[PDB]
Structure formats: C-alpha cells, structure tokens
Amino acid sequence: RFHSFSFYELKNVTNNFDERPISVGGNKGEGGFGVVYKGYVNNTTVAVKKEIKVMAKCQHENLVELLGFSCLVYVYMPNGSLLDRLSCLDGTPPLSWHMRCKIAQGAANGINFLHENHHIHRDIKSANILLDEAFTAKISDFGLARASETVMTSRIVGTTAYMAPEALRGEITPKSDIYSFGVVLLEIITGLPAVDEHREPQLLLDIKEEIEDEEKTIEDYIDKKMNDADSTSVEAMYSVASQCLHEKKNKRPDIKKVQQLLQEMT
Numbered sequence: 001r002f003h004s005f006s007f008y009e010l011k012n013v014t015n016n017f018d019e020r021p022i023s024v025g026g027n028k029g030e031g032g033f034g035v036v037y038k039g040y041v042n043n044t045t046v047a048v049k050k051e052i053k054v055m056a057k058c059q060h061e062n063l064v065e066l067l068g069f070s071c072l073v074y075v076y077m078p079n080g081s082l083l084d085r086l087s088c089l090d091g092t093p094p095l096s097w098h099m100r101c102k103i104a105q106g107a108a109n110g111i112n113f114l115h116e117n118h119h120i121h122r123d124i125k126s127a128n129i130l131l132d133e134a135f136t137a138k139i140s141d142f143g144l145a146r147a148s149e150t151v152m153t154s155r156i157v158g159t160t161a162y163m164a165p166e167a168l169r170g171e172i173t174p175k176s177d178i179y180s181f182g183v184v185l186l187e188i189i190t191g192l193p194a195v196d197e198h199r200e201p202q203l204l205l206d207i208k209e210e211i212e213d214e215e216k217t218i219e220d221y222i223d224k225k226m227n228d229a230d231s232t233s234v235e236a237m238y239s240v241a242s243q244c245l246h247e248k249k250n251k252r253p254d255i256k257k258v259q260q261l262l263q264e265m266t
C-alpha cells in the first residue's frame, strides 16, 4: 500500500523544491492546497504535493494512484490536466475528437467506480482530470471526497463554474458529480474553459439554453481545433452533456447511464 516518506528525501528528489516550470529545467503545477513538483525516486518519476482511506479503498485505472506520503506522493501523470490540453498549454497539439471520446469514457468509468463504491468526489472538473503517458483519464484530488449513504453541509465546497445548484445550496449527493461531469463534457466538445470573464457568456453551462432556445447550434460551438469530429457522435456527446446538466438533480441520469450512452456513442 502506502510508502511512508521522510521530508528530506522528498526535498532532494524534487531538486530541492525547484519551483521553476519543468519546461524551463525545473520541477514545478500548483493549486489551492499546495504545489506539485516532479520527482525522481530511484527511477520512479513521481508527483509530490503537500481522504487517504478513500485513496486506500479506491484503486482503479481511471483514478490517480496514491503511492506515498511524509502529505502525498502520487503516480506522476506526464500529460497534465484535461484543462491544460484543451487549452493547448505550452504549445501541446490540440486533442483529436477520437482521443476526446476515449477521455470522456475513461473519466465516466472513473466516476462510476467512485459511485459504485459510495463516494462523492465533489470537485469533478477538467483540472481534476489528469492524463498519463497514454492519455488515459485519471480522476484526481479526492481531498473534498465524502462517503455516501442526501445530507447537507455548512462547509460548502467545490468550483463555482462546475457546481450543481443543489451542491451550491449545501446538499451532498453523487448527483452533483453527474452535473459537473456534464460541464466537463461541454469543455471537451467546445474546447472552452467553464468560465472566461472576457467572454459572453462567462459561464459555459449557459450555452445549453442558447442551444435549447435554438438561437445557436452545438455545431456553432464545436471546437474548430479538430478535423475528425463527426456531427453524429458530437451530438451524441452533447445529448449526454445536456442530460447531466438538468437543473433538477433527480432528472439527471446516473453514472451507469452516462457510461452506457458514451460507449454507445462510440
């Protein structure tokens, strides 16, 4: 299971917490809980950051593996996040439609495993979908995760732009994950971030209504940085997105349904 690390080995593996981007010769990614550095341990490139029983019960090919702690050490995901690859950050090639279908499938297989096992992720978003050497989807960051039995909470957590209305009111339910996934699927289709302040609309989930009021087609929104995207499977994916984004929790499909529809799309 989990290798217990001393801090001093971690320090030195990360070239003494070299905070420089790896693209410039360093070891640095960073989020709202810590900084993630590339490590070289024996010959195992790892990812080191600053729940564990969740990672201890939940192993799956579409979930990042926790290796160890001092704290947290992870299998290291070469290709970064889905958000950064959708953005083409640091000049990476745009993701093909074929590849985007596989990633959506893998991410749904990942969340399915979590729901079967009665967990609620609570922060499903494209930044929390990592990609290994082979671009296999790895759901990450189970710091907010909760075991399930719908309850409420005074400590509302998540990322605003991906959050279900009931998740923003303080309810806790896997149903919110489904909603967040629907926003991820929209990100995959259009290659647009869930929120852009200098955009209209600022919130990607708002395109559902532009489309429903047939003011726009999903075709207008399709990421133009692809040449392998057929109308039929794009609409098939959008349809699944739309269902996940039903503003009423009990109307959304469950993850088993989302999964079978994404497999049928392919």
Ligand SMILES: Nc1ncnc2c1ncn2[C@@H]1O[C@H](COP(=O)(O)OP(=O)(O)NP(=O)(O)O)[C@@H](O)[C@H]1O
Pocket: 029, 030, 031, 032, 033, 034, 035, 036, 047, 064, 074, 075, 076, 077, 078, 080, 081, 123, 127, 128, 130, 140, 141
């Ligand atoms: N296991 C990993 N392998 C490779 N990169 C990782 C791994 N875990 C995290 N990262 C990267 O480390 C950075 C920090 O991630 P994280 O601390 O989870 O913040 P975030 O998901 O971007 N936002 P939040 O989860 O709200 O704090 C991100 O840039 C990730 O791309």
